[PDB]
Amino acid sequence: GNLDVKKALLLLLVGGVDKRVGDGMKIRGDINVCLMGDPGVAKSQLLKAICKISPRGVYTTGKGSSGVGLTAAVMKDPVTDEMILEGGALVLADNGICCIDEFDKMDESDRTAIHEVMEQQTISISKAGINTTLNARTSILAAANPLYGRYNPRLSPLDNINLPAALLSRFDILFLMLDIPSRDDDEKLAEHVTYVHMHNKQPDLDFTPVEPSKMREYIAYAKTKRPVMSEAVNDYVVQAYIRLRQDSKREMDSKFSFGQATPRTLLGIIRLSQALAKLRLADMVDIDDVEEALRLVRVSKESLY
Amino acid sequence: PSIYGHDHIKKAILLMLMGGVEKNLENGSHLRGDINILMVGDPSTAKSQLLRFVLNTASLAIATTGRGSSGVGLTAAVTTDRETGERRLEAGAMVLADRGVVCIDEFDKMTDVDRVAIHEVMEQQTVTIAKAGIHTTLNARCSVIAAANPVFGQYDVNRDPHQNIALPDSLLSRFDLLFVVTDDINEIRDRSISEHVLRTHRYLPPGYLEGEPVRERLNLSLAVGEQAGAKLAKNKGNYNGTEIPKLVTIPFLRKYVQYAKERVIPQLTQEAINVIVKNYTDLRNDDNTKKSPITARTLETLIRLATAHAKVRLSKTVNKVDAKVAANLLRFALLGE
Amino acid sequence: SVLAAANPIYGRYDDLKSPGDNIDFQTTILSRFDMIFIVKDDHNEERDISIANHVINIHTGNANAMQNQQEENGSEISIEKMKRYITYCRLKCAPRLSPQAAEKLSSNFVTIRKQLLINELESTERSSIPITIRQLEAIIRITESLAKLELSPIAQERHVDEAIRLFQASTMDAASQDPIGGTSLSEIRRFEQELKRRLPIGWSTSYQTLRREFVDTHRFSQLALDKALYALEKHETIQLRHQGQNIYRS
Amino acid sequence: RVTLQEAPGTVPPGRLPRHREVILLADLVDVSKPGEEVEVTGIYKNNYDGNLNAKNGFPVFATIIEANSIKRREGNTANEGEEGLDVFSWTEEEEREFRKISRDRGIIDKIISSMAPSIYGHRDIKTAVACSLFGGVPKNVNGKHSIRGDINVLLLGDPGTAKSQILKYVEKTAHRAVFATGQGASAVGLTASVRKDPITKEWTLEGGALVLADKGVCLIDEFDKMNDQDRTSIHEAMEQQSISISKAGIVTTLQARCSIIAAANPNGGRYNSTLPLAQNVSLTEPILSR
Amino acid sequence: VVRDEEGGDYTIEAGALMLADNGICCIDEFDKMDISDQVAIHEAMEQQTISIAKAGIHATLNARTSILAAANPVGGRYNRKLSLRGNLNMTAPIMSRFDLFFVILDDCNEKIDTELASHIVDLHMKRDEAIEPPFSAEQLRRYIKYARTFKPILTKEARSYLVEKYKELRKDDAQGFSRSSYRITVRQLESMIRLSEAIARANCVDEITPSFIAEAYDLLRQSIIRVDV
Amino acid sequence: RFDLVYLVLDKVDEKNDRELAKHLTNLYLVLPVEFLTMYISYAKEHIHPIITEAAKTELVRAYVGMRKMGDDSRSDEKRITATTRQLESMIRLAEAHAKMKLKNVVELEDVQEAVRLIRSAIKDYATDPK
DNA sequence: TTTTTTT
DNA sequence: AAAAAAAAAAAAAAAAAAA
Ligand SMILES: Nc1ncnc2c1ncn2[C@@H]1O[C@H](COP(=O)(O)OP(=O)(O)OP(=O)(O)O)[C@@H](O)[C@H]1O
Ligand SMILES: Nc1ncnc2c1ncn2[C@@H]1O[C@H](COP(=O)(O)OP(=O)(O)OP(=O)(O)O)[C@@H](O)[C@H]1O
Ligand SMILES: Nc1ncnc2c1ncn2[C@@H]1O[C@H](COP(=O)(O)OP(=O)(O)OP(=O)(O)O)[C@@H](O)[C@H]1O
Ligand SMILES: [Mg+2]
Ligand SMILES: [Mg+2]
């Protein structure tokens, strides 16, 4: 299952609108999507699969070592101890894919680093006069678990993930994985898992015409094409944002308060439409891409209930 | 034999000592293969004694205590060899017990920091050391048995099970089987256990009189040591007559375990699949109170328990009887008889 | 072996306050211990007179002679001889039990377990001092030590009785020491009203008649017996004589 | 040989001390103890060194002080009453006059009236302080019973009652005086502490405040406001007269003969006469009874 | 006390008051305070010294300081109904440590604020360096260092008037209420002695005139006239 | 004790959202150069403007006015909203207005701009009451 | 305001 | 003539935090 999560993964692998605008204003093609759900939903396993299928993916999780962030790998490395360093930098953050597990586990230092990597902002932390900042341009994909270990009947934003609201609003897409006890889904899941166990392989039950090497080729191919933006979508996206602000006119009704008002919502909408135009098609942007992006956003939002 | 009751605990220990096989896929990476069991209960109900028995019975085992250990010193250490003047990794505690079993006492009384390390070794059974110019991954495929006290002095049966335990659910969901033991005060059971304990304390080592204490002894006569099928000297195992059911001595049991862990690698079949899936679907939607919530990983536990029970009866295929016994044991361990 | 000296909260034991919030130790730690002695301070002025006498005597001007006589009459022995005796007894002997002692221990353990249950179901909170199998091992080891003291290679009823007496002292002083911690009190005042009206000062009545009457009424047996024995504990208007048959109103 | 720093009360504020080395020849051995303030009369001498000339590039010389006389100056800063190495030592005629004036009638009256002649009233305190700084006789019965022979004293009342002046005079009076106050003393500070030697590179014991008070008095000001964790650690020092440490592999027992004089303030800053002592202070029976 | 890690002797660091030693100190925003530092200072002011023994080291420090502090009424503005104890949260014993109090109030009068604004503006313009005090700073310092070299003594009439005034003060403020009014101690008498000595020192006189005692008593009286207003 | 304060409150309206969306789309779809820096430096260190006697009357009138605006005929005992910090702030702001345009003495326009600027933020500084 | 825990 | 030091374990004091 989990088709729409994989669709979002596809749209994350291509990248959004990039290469700046007039007057030099900064825009990034990277997409920040956070996965949220109960334990035992195999979001970590899907993250591992994505890390395997991507060349630039880097995987991180809660603690276990102190060299993951804020320090270069060459700290005190040479036998002569030349203090080789760059200063403020992360692990291959230039055009990397930062995969994080247990996003509510790390300390304040890693949290400060991930607030600093925001929106293609470079890392300029200095300790001994070093100011060679690392050009941080990476897509953020992180999985976090609720502090209760389960979904809650009361309001979600107060339950949240014990995360800053600014950091939450930074992310482009928030998706949920809620365990619903039911017969017709658990039956299929158990059947698939046991059939996998019986064959000791990937069973012929799966029906996939395309292969991991084939995906690795086609993703680079699609990124190479790089379609440009089409003007006529302007009015459609403006009225879409008008109705989204109409939603914000109803966000004080509560019972879920993720229908906030933020220009980053429109920016992510445009980025996802550009990614949909990039994954296929000619050098234009289709209105159907905007509609698909809005439908994806609606599917992400409706998981609250 | 000196521990009264706790029959299902003994069965769980037996199944754990000879757990299921490992699974590795060219695309599916690796799947965990053995069983882990946790004990929480009221004080003085013979948990440490059973853990000591598991220490002595198993082939390879290492003893750890929550308060007497440090997480960084548990997995690896950076020490310099004297002759070469070079600093080399020193094997940690649980790395020495790879493929064996590690027993932890006073588990909940451990420092929280060390706990995260445990989660790592319960995630993919591998510990990585990146420090002082060494980057290496160390294999550790051991199983963990542990016992912990409730938050209060005694277990409160009217409260939330999560309220009674000090450990976060993140690592508690990792454990396959969780057992709750409580000493219900019933005069009949009191008399029975009193008879058993008083029977135990009146024991004398053979060939030795009762008037003097136990003394130290010398080693075996030979520094190095090393008609068939007609004697059954220790084969039947019944050393003395106390009950109609038979018993077996420890060395024969260890020989059976050694034979079973090597000579058979069973495979499951579709009938056990049908039984397991039916039980999982029923348990998922029984919709009543339970000690712990259930998820998809319990089906893995059923699969591995069926595999272990097939290993017990020395069959190359898993039959539905093992599915039935695994389901019954799980229902006992999570619902309660 | 572990020997520990500890003070309760608020200094003095403060019997008016419940035992549960007088001892801060958890249930686990107390179970490992097996002899717990509540040393309360009391004022009756005769023990006080005797203690003042003993202290002023043990003042170094006097006791330095008197203790010497304890080594001259053979009443007490020197410390180092005791040290040699204990090391010799530890090395030499290690006694064993007998089946009759086992049966007696089993019955005594069942009795104390039942008493703990009957206290708990009344107070309706968990006992601050538990009774578990470790206490049975404790009594067994106490009996073993008692037999070891005399080098007898077996332990018999003579040591078992002393061990049970010591255990009962050390458990009744602490665990069952007022387990209630001080229907509610409404029936208590109703009960006290009627016997005062019905039964005057100087006469007496049978226990069975009172129990029958107040079980026939709403008081019932559980409430009346505790009320009767606490009115006795008041020890200012009602006295017991001639076994439990006569209820004398002084 | 020993290292001599500057007195913290003598160095200019916010500066750093200057160390010197003092060598103690025969008969002066062990006269000085760690942590105490001392005054030494000696000879200043210079000698050649190699590494000193190496690290500076100039012909620099080292200097050491050969001790010739040592005088203790801990606590008793009143240094004008008399001269000499030891002001608590007596001549023979001083002993004769002690005997002569120890026999007249009402000598206790004169002694009690001769303490703090600048404070009016408070006769009971002027008696209790003398009885505290004389002390009793420690008793040892057969070597198996021990009876403490020193008296503790506690003061209590409203502000403005000149308690601190009495404490200062007591410090000026006794042979061994240690002064503490309020939050300014920690539990591990009064008692001996475990320290790792920065040179020999292992654990060792560091003398606490009470150790300096052995055969002497320890004075505490603002007893009530001291945190209870900083207060419960001196029970053995009051009663058993013994200090035991089992820390970092070291299991030792020290010796401490100290008399504690403490002062405090009741709840609310004033003593309410119409209430018992239990509702006037926050202390409990175990500490009060001592 | 400060140490480098695994560094012996815990070398002490001088505090702000310790730096202020042997000289005049100034404190600002006095109401906010460290509780441990507060209980240190209120015993330190009477002793005029502070001694802290920690981590196996002990020492006695000198803190011969004159304290000058400013506070703020609780609730923003001074409530005229209540008194200093009601208005300030600062503890009772410290109030008796201080010898004088000054309370200043701002108002909405139209005549005052115009004068204040004129004074403030008139400094950025015109007499930017031509404000008119009767004496220059150098003259002030010359007179201060000439007067500081005088030590007054007391006479018989001074002592008699002094004890009479002390008795009057003690009886007057004790007649108000019990267990809610407690402000006159012997330290108040010592403060009045010190103030009289200072006043006589201002006029460069080697003796004491009872008029100085009258002025000091008036100051301490208005410090209690103000607590009622 | 800050000199001034500013508040930004984004509320959803059809119009303002329409203009914001149009502006953002147009940008996504008259400015000097380091000349600014050298001009700022020249004003900073060559120019030392001072206030004049005429501006004092306007300053004191504004102070008296906001004192009155901070009070009413009723006995509510209104907070004293006209603090000395306000006078210091307006003096500094009037000096700053003369700092630009390279003038040497302030004019009335400077003080009216300064007082309007200092009072605009106060006008939106009120809580839910009034 | 107090005790606890972390640096 | 010189191996000498990064990595651990254990003992405090200060500050801040929660009840
Ligand atoms: N949809 C699914 N299909 C197949 N297996 C699944 C599915 N959901 C869960 N599982 C099983 O659950 C396990 C992975 O869940 P896991 O708890 O590791 O992931 P998670 O939700 O990221 O949580 P956690 O932080 O506890 O690891 C695997 O054993 C996997 O087989
Ligand atoms: N069923 C039983 N059979 C035999 N002995 C028993 C039984 N139940 C309890 N005991 C006895 O109870 C005692 C408890 O010892 P032990 O410390 O091992 O128990 P525990 O339940 O693990 O306690 P803890 O949690 O305090 O470690 C032992 O002496 C053991 O012999
Ligand atoms: N007879 C006396 N009684 C009380 N105080 C006196 C007497 N004679 C002089 N004094 C002065 O009274 C003052 C009282 O001392 P101080 O103000 O230092 O505090 P305290 O009373 O010792 O205690 P606290 O610090 O607890 O208030 C001293 O300055 C002392 O010189
Ligand atoms: Mg996960
Ligand atoms: Mg146990």
Helices (runs of H) and strands (runs of E) counted in chain D: 9, 14
Three-state SS string across B158-193, please?
A: CCCCCCCCCCCHHHHCCCCEEEEECCCCCHHHHHHH
Residue E229 and residue E80 in contact, taking contact as beta carbons nearer than 8 Å: yes
Closest CA to B9 of B48, B37, B43, B44: B37
Closest CA to C174 of C42, C2, C13: C13
Residue minimizing CA distance to atom 11 of ligand 2: B46
Distance from CA of C125 to the nearest CA of D (A): 29
What protein residues have CB closer than 5 angstroms to ion ligand 5?
A: B 48
> Which residues make beta-bridge pairs with A33?
A141, A173
DSSP codes, E20-85: HTTEE----S-SS--HHHHHHHHHHHHHTEE--BBTTB---EE--EE-------TTSS--TTS-HH
| 3-class DSSP assignment, residue B23 | strand
Q: Where are the alpha helices (DSSP H) in chain E?
A: 16-20, 35-47, 84-87, 92-95, 110-124, 137-147, 156-174, 186-202, 210-228
- Least CA distance to C137: which residue of chain B? B197
Query: Using CA of residue A36, residue A39, residue A41, residue A45, what is the dihedral sign?
Result: positive
Q: CA-CA distance, A256 to A36, in Å (whole number)?
A: 15
C-alpha A133: how far from chain center: 24
Closest CA to F118 of F87, F72, F78, F84: F87
In the numeric block, which tokens belong to residue E31? 């109401």
- Least CA distance to B317: which residue of chain A? A198
Burial B226-262 (b: 16+ CB within 10 A, else e): eeeeeeeeeeeeeeeeeeeeeeeeeeeeeeebeebee
A150 is in an annotated binding site: no
Query: Look-up: residue for tokens 């699949």?
Result: B273
* Chain H nucleotides covered by protein, CB below 7 Å: 3-15
Residue A53 and residue A216 in contact, taking contact as beta carbons nearer than 8 Å: yes
Query: Using CA of residue D78, residue D83, residue D85, residue D91, what is the dihedral sign?
Result: negative
In the numeric block, which tokens belong to residue A16? 């959004």
CA of D150: how far to CAs of C69, D142, D215, D220, D235, in Å? 31, 20, 10, 16, 14
Rounded, the Å distance between the CA of B70 and C1' of H3 is: 30
Q: What are phi and psi of C27, to 5 degrees?
A: -70, -35
Q: CA-CA distance, F24 to F22, in Å (whole number)?
A: 6
Nearest atom within ligand 1 for CA of residue A143 = 22
Opening angle at CA F84, ends F79 and F85, nearest 5 = 95
Distance from CA of D141 to the nearest CA of C (A): 6
Half-sphere exposure of E206 (CA within 13 A, CB side): 1
Q: What share of chain F is helix, strand, coil (3-state, %, to 5)?
A: 60, 0, 40
Please write down the long-range contacts of A292-295, taking CB distance under 8 Å and 24 or more positions apart: A293/A269, A294/A240, A294/A269
| 3-class DSSP assignment, residue E15 | coil
Q: Write the single-letter amino acid at E138.
A: E
**Which residues have CB under 8 Å from A125's CB, separation 6+?**
A70, A87, A88, A116
**Which residues have CB under 8 Å from F85's CB, separation 6+?**
F1
Q: CA-CA distance, F69 to F81, in Å (whole number)?
A: 9
- The helix-helix angle for A263-278 and A233-248 (nearest 10°) equals 140
Q: What is the dihedral of CA A186, A188, A191, A196, to 10 degrees?
A: -110
Half-sphere exposure of B332 (CA within 13 A, CB side): 14
Q: Which helix (H) or strand (E) holds B63?
A: strand B61-65
| 3-class DSSP assignment, residue B106 | coil
Q: Nearest-CA residue to the C1' of H6? A: B132
Q: What are phi and psi of B269, to 5 degrees?
A: -135, 175
D158 touches strand G (CB under 7 A): no
Within 10 Å of residue E180's Cβ, how many Cβ atoms? 7
Q: CA-CA distance, B266 to B20, in Å (whole number)?
A: 9
Contact A202 B28 (CB under 8 A): yes
Residue C113 and residue B185 in contact, taking contact as beta carbons nearer than 8 Å: yes
Closest CA to B167 of B204, B126, B118: B118
B305 dihedral zone (left: phi>0; alpha: psi -120 to 50; beta): alpha
B288 touches chain A (CB under 8 A): no
Q: CA-CA distance, B92 to B73, in Å (whole number)?
A: 6
Bind-site residues of B: 41-48
Residue B54 and residue B61 in contact, taking contact as beta carbons nearer than 8 Å: yes
Q: Which nucleotide is nearest to B129 (CA to C1')?
A: H7
| Interface subset of D 121-140, CB within 8 angstroms of C | 139-140
Residue C10 and residue D283 in contact, taking contact as beta carbons nearer than 8 Å: no
E163 dihedral zone (left: phi>0; alpha: psi -120 to 50; beta): alpha
| 3-class DSSP assignment, residue B97 | coil
Contact D35 E58 (CB under 8 A): yes
Q: CA-CA distance, B136 to E139, in Å (whole number)?
A: 79
Contact F64 E125 (CB under 8 A): no
Domain boundaries, chain A: 1-300
Overall CATH class of domain A1-300: alpha beta
Choosing from B7, B44, B201 the residue with most ligand 2 atoms within 8 A of its CB, the one to mutate for a pocket test is B44
Closest CA to E53 of D35, D244, D19: D35
Q: CA-CA distance, B170 to B174, in Å (whole number)?
A: 7
Query: Using CA of residue A173, residue A178, residue A182, residue A183, what is the dihedral sign?
Result: positive
In the numeric block, which tokens belong to residue A167? 């950091």
In the numeric block, which tokens belong to residue B19? 């757990």
In the numeric block, which tokens belong to residue A215? 């995906």
Supply the DSSP symbol for B1: -
F50 touches chain A (CB under 8 A): no
> Which residues make beta-bridge pairs with D220?
D180, D262
Three-state SS string across chain A, please?
A: CCHHHHHHHHHHHHCCCCCCCHHHCCCCCCCCEEEEECCCCCHHHHHHHHHHHCCCEEEECCCCCCCCCCCCCCCCCCCCCCCCCCCCCCCCCEEEEEEEECCCCCCHHHHHHHHHCHHHCCECCCCCCCCCCECCEEEEEEEECCCCCCCCCCCHHHHCCCCCHHHHHHCCEEEEECCCCCHHHHHHHHHHHHHHHHHCCCCCCCCCCCCHHHHHHHHHHHHHHCCCCCCCHHHHHHHHHHHHHHHHCCHHHCCCCCCCCCHHHHHHHHHHHHHHHHCCCCCCCCHHHHHHHHHHHHHHHHCCC
Q: How far is the CA of A39 from the centre of ligand 4 (A)?
A: 6
CATH numbers and ranges of domains, chain E: 1-229 (3.40.50.300)
Residue F94 and residue F110 in contact, taking contact as beta carbons nearer than 8 Å: yes
Q: Write the single-letter amino acid at E19.
A: L
| 3-class DSSP assignment, residue F102 | helix
Q: CA-CA distance, D200 to C168, in Å (whole number)?
A: 56
Q: Write the single-letter amino acid at F80.
A: I
Q: Which method was it determined by?
A: cryo-EM
Contact A198 B268 (CB under 8 A): yes
Choosing from B9, B45, B104 the residue with most ligand 2 atoms within 8 A of its CB, the one to mutate for a pocket test is B45
Distance from CA of E117 to the nearest CA of F (A): 7
In the numeric block, which tokens belong to residue C30? 């107390």
**How many Å is the maximal CA-CA distance in chain B?**
68
